Amino acid sequence: RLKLKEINVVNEITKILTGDYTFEESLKEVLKVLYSYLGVEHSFIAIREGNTLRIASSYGYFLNKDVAFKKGEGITGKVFQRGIPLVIPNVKHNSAFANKTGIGRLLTEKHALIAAPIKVGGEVKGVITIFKEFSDKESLENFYQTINVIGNLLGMFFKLRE
Amino acid sequence: RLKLKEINVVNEITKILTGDYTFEESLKEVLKVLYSYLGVEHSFIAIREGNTLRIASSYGYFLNKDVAFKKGEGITGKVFQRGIPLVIPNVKHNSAFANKTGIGRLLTEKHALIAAPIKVGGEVKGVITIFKEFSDKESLENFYQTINVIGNLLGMFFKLRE
Ligand SMILES: [Cl-]
Numbered sequence: 001r002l003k004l005k006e007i008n009v010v011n012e013i014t015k016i017l018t019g020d021y022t023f024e025e026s027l028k029e030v031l032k033v034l035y036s037y038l039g040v041e042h043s044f045i046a047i048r049e050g051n052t053l054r055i056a057s058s059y060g061y062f063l064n065k066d067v068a069f070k071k072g073e074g075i076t077g078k079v080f081q082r083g084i085p086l087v088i089p090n091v092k093h094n095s096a097f098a099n100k101t102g103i104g105r106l107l108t109e110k111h112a113l114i115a116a117p118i119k120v121g122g123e124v125k126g127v128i129t130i131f132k133e134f135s136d137k138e139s140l141e142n143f144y145q146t147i148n149v150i151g152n153l154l155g156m157f158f159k160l161r162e
Numbered sequence: 163r164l165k166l167k168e169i170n171v172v173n174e175i176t177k178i179l180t181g182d183y184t185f186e187e188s189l190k191e192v193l194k195v196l197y198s199y200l201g202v203e204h205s206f207i208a209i210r211e212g213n214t215l216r217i218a219s220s221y222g223y224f225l226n227k228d229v230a231f232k233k234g235e236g237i238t239g240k241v242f243q244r245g246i247p248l249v250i251p252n253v254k255h256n257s258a259f260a261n262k263t264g265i266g267r268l269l270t271e272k273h274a275l276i277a278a279p280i281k282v283g284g285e286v287k288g289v290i291t292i293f294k295e296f297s298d299k300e301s302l303e304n305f306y307q308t309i310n311v312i313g314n315l316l317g318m319f320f321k322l323r324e
Pocket residue numbers: 015016019
């Protein structure tokens with residue numbers, strides 16, 4: 001049951017983020033458990049450097065990639081600017097998908113992209129972006145609720161670590 | 163749509179808890195938004211002092227009531243002990259309901275009790291307990307996930323405020 005895995009992964013992420021790991025190690029471990037609990041094969045967390053977004057931690061294909069997004073740039077960039085999420089089914093062939101890392105070639109037709117804002121005091125400080133396969137648009141919409149929760153936990157972690 | 167209100171209340175709670183309100187005002191405001199967004203008319207957040215839980219904040223019937231729970235004592239005490247949630251339909255008539263606060267006589271048969279742990283580093287530091295009417299076991303299960311999420315946000319907050 002997916003909901004059961006979602007409950008458990010949220011609990012586990014809270015345990016990690018209330019621990020004493022470094023900022024970078026904490027983010028990395030969150031993405032690792034998204035893989036091991038929820039099957040998220042590729043993901044990253046990008047952090048604001050003023051008006052630009054830079055990948056701070058990654059899992060899967062984004063390892064050893066140094067990428068940046070400007071406000072309005074692609075899916076992640078729009079989420080950064082507006083502080084509202086984007087849920088994009090079959091992203092491989094979506095027009096707004098900027099595929100800034102050539103990851104598209106590595107996706108299938110079922111992969112969706114969900115990008116959610118990370119907010120502190122209601123202001124966007126980062127974005128979490130994940131790729132995961134879905135068979136129908138309804139299951140995708142449900143899954144977004146969980147990724148939104150994780151974005152919020154990350155917002156509290158950003159506050160915690162100043 | 164309920165899912166939409168749940169998403170919005172989680173965002174709002176994160177905004178409150180990453181702000182600068184006092185510890186007690188923050189907890190109270192969380193319970194206030196549970197009422198305003200999700201219709202939760204009676205609730206409390208209890209915090210661990212030594213090895214006992216004490217009510218730190220309350221809303222509705224629990225206002226101005228001093229109540230302590232020991233590990234294993236009643237429904238809230240069991241969540242405290244095991245660090246796993248309880249979802250009790252028709253709590254008014256449940257054998258494990260200690261009805262410490264005598265709220266029982268004010269509840270209808272439709273009221274459920276949902277109690278979720280508040281964990282820091284995986285250790286139980288408190289419990290959030292809510293009472294709310296439901297018309298079927300199914301919608302109760304969905305609602306439980308959201309209360310669990312709020313317990314996790316509160317865990318982050320407890321870490322934030324030392
Ligand atoms: Cl840990």
